[PDB]
Amino acid sequence: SRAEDYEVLYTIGTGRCQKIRRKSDGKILVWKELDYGSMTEAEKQMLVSEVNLLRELKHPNIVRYYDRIIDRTNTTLYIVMEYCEGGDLASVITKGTKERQYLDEEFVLRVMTQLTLALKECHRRSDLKPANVFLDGKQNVKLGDFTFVGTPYYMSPEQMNRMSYNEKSDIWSLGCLLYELCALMPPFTAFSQKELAGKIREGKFRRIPYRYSDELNEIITRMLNLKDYHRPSVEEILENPLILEHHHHHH
Ligand SMILES: COc1cc(-c2cnc(N)c(-c3ccc(C(=O)O)cc3)n2)cc(OC)c1OC
Ligand SMILES: [Cl-]
Ligand SMILES: [Cl-]
Ligand SMILES: [Cl-]
């Protein structure tokens, strides 16, 4: 479809993401705008293929990407996707830090269950961090968004030695994300990357807060094992007695 099919309501975050309304039925959506005006033919060809793959991902726990619009006037590409009224997990963690208020174990179990399912789908088809995890209005958790200055808090031991495909590296990142949801801080912190790497290598961290059960602590701790082969698989995580039907997605 074309941009005129939609009305911009307002900007959510600055490419730039905006909440929009589809005129045909008034459906509330979001689009992300990419300015391809400075791109080469080679970069546009890569872009096209990536957007195409994006359109093929249909999963309850992956942000749904509906359409792509070209506006040759502004040299802008619009990627239309579902609206997640709950925002991102980064804002939830920030909210708790400042409220001196930990999140319910039930919420952490929802995020664990639903993100593990998202990872399972990604692995089948073959950037896990709080700002890339979105919440809808029905308690559902969705993975979205498929270089310097930033601190690589979630970088796994093996990935810091040599960046290569390893599904157990994703489990480490999930571990880090769940840890942060509980403790409201990442398991490893430092002011420099050299110091960070030394800590990650040592593999030691504080227990998550005592309000969280030993069982939750145990599985998060297993995900943060220094040995990739000691971390639980997606299958092993979902077998955990903590995970129940109600922690999964519901339309
Ligand atoms: C980054 O902060 C926020 C993001 C959103 C939001 C809602 N729906 C969405 N589909 C998205 C979203 C935006 C971009 C991407 C992506 O680049 O793939 C994936 C998801 N963000 C909503 C927000 O509040 C309504 C919000 O503020 C906390
Ligand atoms: Cl606190
Ligand atoms: Cl919450
Ligand atoms: Cl759903």
Residues in the chain: 251
Strand 27-35 versus strand 65-71 pairing type: unpaired
Q: Which of 84, 117, 136 is the last residue of a domain?
A: 84
Ligand 3 centroid from CA 251, angstroms: 18
Q: Which of 53, 84, 115 is the last residue of a domain?
A: 84
Annotated catalytic residue within 5, 127, 145, 214: 127
**DSSP helix/strand/coil, 209:** coil
User: What residue owns the CA closest to ligand 1's atom 18?
Assistant: 145
User: What residue owns the CA closest to ligand 1's atom 2?
Assistant: 87
CATH classification of the domain holding 194:
1.10.510.10
127 classed as catalytic: yes
Structure-determination technique: X-ray
Does an H or E element contain 52, and which? helix 41-56
Residue 78 near residue 84 (C-beta atoms within 8 A): no
**Ligand 1 nearest-atom number relative to CA 81:** 10
Q: What resolution in angstroms does the PDB record give?
A: 2.0
Closest among 76, 174, 172 to 130, alpha carbons compared: 174
Give how far Cα 239 sits from Cα of 108, 174, 213, Å.
16, 16, 17
Whole-number Å distance between alpha carbons of 221 and 203 = 10
Whether residues 230 and 195 share a domain: the answer is: yes
Q: Ligand 1: residues whose CB is within 6 Å?
A: 12-13, 17, 30, 32, 63, 81-85, 87-88, 91, 134, 144-145
Residue 16's domain comprises 1-40+64-84
List, comma-separated, the residues after which the chain is broken, a break being a C to N distance over 2.5 A; otherwise answer none: 14, 126, 146
Whole-number Å distance between alpha carbons of 174 and 220 = 8
Q: How is residue 167 written in tokens?
A: 């599904």
Which residue's entry shows tokens 């579902």? 82
Whole-number Å distance between alpha carbons of 161 and 226 = 13
Q: How many angstroms from the chain centroid is the CA of residue 154?
A: 12
Whole-number Å distance between alpha carbons of 237 and 106 = 16
Residue 20 near residue 66 (C-beta atoms within 8 A): no
